[PDB]
Symmetry: D2
Subunit: 124 residues, 4 copies
Amino acid sequence: GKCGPPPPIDNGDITSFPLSVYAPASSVEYQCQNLYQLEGNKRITCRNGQWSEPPKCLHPCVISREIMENYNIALRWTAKQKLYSRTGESVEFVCKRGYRLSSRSHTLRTTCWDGKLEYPTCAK
Amino acid sequence: GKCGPPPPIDNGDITSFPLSVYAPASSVEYQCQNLYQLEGNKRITCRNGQWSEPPKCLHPCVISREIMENYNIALRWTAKQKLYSRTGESVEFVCKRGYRLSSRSHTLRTTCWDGKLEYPTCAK
Amino acid sequence: GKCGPPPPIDNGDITSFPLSVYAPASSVEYQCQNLYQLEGNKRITCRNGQWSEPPKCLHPCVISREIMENYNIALRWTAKQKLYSRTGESVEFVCKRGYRLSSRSHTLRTTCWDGKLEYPTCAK
Amino acid sequence: GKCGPPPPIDNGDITSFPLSVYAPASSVEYQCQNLYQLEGNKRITCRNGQWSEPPKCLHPCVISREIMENYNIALRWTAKQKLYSRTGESVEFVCKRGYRLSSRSHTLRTTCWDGKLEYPTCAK
């Protein structure tokens, strides 16, 4: 029931030096890269010749200039610009001068989820 | 023709602090994480409101204990174990004691390509 | 009592995108790079215009070929080579063929502490 | 003249998986972490039982809110805030409203060098 070296995961790394073989019941742990959020259990364990399932590193969201221009919005806090937001973090927008929240628009405050921000839309 | 913040790529990072806006003709550069190999041009450039296409970070290959056991092979160089190999790096195997390269088998020396190693197979 | 951007630390990174200003009572967190061990509290907090003290990323230890050759020792577990060990992890050595632990020698099992391994010594 | 595993350096990493032994004439390469600038030759080579000297990862500079407040300056470009600057990158300041560059002051444009920014000073 020994295991080989643990699997790489995107945007994360194991916290220890990889070995060529691991005894059953051995474990290793992952950490996601800085702006990535680790989803699930960080620890994998060797049992019956296989590692358990690694966690996922959930993607940050990047602000889009073109979407913001198109939707007539700007970041609310010019001194606190979350150009990259972690999964679970919120970004707050405002309508640009001379615009108002459209009907059916998402709230001006919106949450990053694995790369995706649902942007609000303002109308003149 | 200004651009917003540059896009994240898997397993790589930009080498400078991201800005909220970039003038046309501005550029930034990526670096892949250690065992990843950067494919293409590391530099992206802002033109006509869009960034050019970022490079790709090609995946390393991890040795599989179960595949090696199944194919009756071992690493040749026990003092030089490439448990993780970069894209473009080769790994050399040997047949286990009492086995020989099978017909149609890949060569004992084999090259990592973006996560995939084509393993040789030995028969008793 | 607002704070500016949080301080860089060696071999670690903050887990969120840095902002130009932070309100009092704001906090950010650090993570150390993979084989580094974070000593202390990962969180810093902004109070009275200053950040609290960041943690330290304690160094891994690298095995020395020259010291091992000089002290007539080898790693015990040739399939489980901790070429780099985390702070707090132990490395186990053996005497080479035809040698014995010297008097006053450190134990064959020894612990990495912030870059330093105290190696055992064997005599013919 | 064989070498052991290559040495860790602060804020950088080798680009290949470390091996337990290296033949003379072998080489490995370092990369610095994103906002660090690699000074010198990235490649180390094994000769006569020793690795050659690794490069240095030169530190980025972080803007100080307290120094800026004390010197009556602000960043010039509020849409292009280099909160962290690479070694060799310049940061441009302006005097705050109702102040002028002091005599003997450093230029408003100033260059980051391994963590240190020489800030300009303005007087009322």
